[PDB]
Amino acid sequence: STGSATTTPIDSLDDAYITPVQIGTPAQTLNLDFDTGSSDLWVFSSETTASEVDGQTIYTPSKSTTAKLLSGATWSISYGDGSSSSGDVYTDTVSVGGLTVTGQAVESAKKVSSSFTEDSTIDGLLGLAFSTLNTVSPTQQKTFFDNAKASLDSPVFTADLGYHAPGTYNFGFIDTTAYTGSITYTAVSTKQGFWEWTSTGYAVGSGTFKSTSIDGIADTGTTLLYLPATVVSAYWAQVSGAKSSSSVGGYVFPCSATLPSFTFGVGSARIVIPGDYIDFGPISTGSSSCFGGIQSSAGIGINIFGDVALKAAFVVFNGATTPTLGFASK
Numbered sequence: 001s002t003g004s005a006t007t008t009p010i011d012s013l014d015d016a017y018i019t020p021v022q023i024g025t026p027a028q029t030l031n032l033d034f035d036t037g038s039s040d041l042w043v044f045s046s047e048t049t050a051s052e053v054d055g056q057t058i059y060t061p062s063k064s065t066t067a068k069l070l071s072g073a074t075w076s077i078s079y080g081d082g083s084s085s086s087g088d089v090y091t092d093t094v095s096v097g098g099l100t101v102t103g104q105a106v107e108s109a110k111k112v113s114s115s116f117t118e119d120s121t122i123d124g125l126l127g128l129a130f131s132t133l134n135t136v137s138p139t140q141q142k143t144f145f146d147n148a149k150a151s152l153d154s155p156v157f158t159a160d161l162g163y164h165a166p167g168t169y170n171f172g173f174i175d176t177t178a179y180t181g182s183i184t185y186t187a188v189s190t191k192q193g194f195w196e197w198t199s200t201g202y203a204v205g206s207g208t209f210k211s212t213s214i215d216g217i218a219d220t221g222t223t224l225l226y227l228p229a230t231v232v233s234a235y236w237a238q239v240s241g242a243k244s245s246s247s248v249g250g251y252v253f254p255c256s257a258t259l260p261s262f263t264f265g266v267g268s269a270r271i272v273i274p275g276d277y278i279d280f281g282p283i284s285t286g287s288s289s290c291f292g293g294i295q296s297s298a299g300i301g302i303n304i305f306g307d308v309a310l311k312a313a314f315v316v317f318n319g320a321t322t323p324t325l326g327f328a329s330k
Helices: 144-151 229-236
Strands: 003-009 017-023 028-035 041-043 068-078 084-096 099-112 124-127 156-160 167-171 184-187 196-204 210-218 225-227 243-245 250-254 262-266 269-273 279-282 289-292 294-296 303-305 314-318 324-328
Touching (some): 041 084, 068 099, 099 144
Parallel strands (some): 041 099, 225 294
Antiparallel strands (some): 017 028, 017 084, 156 314, 196 262, 243 250, 314 324
């Protein structure tokens, strides 16, 4: 089998991407944030504290004839950005772009933190990291991809995120029309449960390429590109007027400035992030100070190849017995 779904930016900045997901019988369609940095499929629901729901579409398990309570099961998650949620668990039928899993753990939120409530466009998350990070207790549950894997034509999914535009998640096949050149595959460590890999280096604009190993994760659920402070300093030094602002919480720059591209290494291959991808607009409405899309990972404890980087590439998440990542230009 295969599946293919369009993923759509939630706003004009590509702060995140939502993908429609069918849950239950009859189908309840929710717009979920596909997140290769986590491993829980959780949704706003009829069980979510009323005051914490503000415009989201909810899953109502009582209206699904295929929903079954996973008795005794609870979940609770906290994300790198400080947000969180928790609740109980049902199993139900879940379909993504024509690909159907029966008996998928659907984690129903009883509580969500403010940032989720405040974002009316995201109805939940669909985790695509490794199932070892799944938070369901006492019995850990598998991700949608893990459950679908054996049935797929090939045990892979691909992320093709758009710049200020929709893109595509495919399951079970590689669309050879979606990228230019060849796909370069690179080793993955699953030891922290992430799609973790090592970039071979970087370049700033037309500058010479610096060969240096950068360990990080391919994370569709993170907006920006978070890299070591040295790398990030080298980038923003090439932007007139840029500075790191402790009050704002990272690098900012005047919108009158021209942003250089940023290139990262995949083996001997090279992915170029155009400068425009690194602009995240005014820090506040009307401000001439713009927020940068490349920021320091210092104090996160891991480097994160988030949407800023991934949307410059066609990315293969290869779930073969030994997982790998593939990157192509497009």
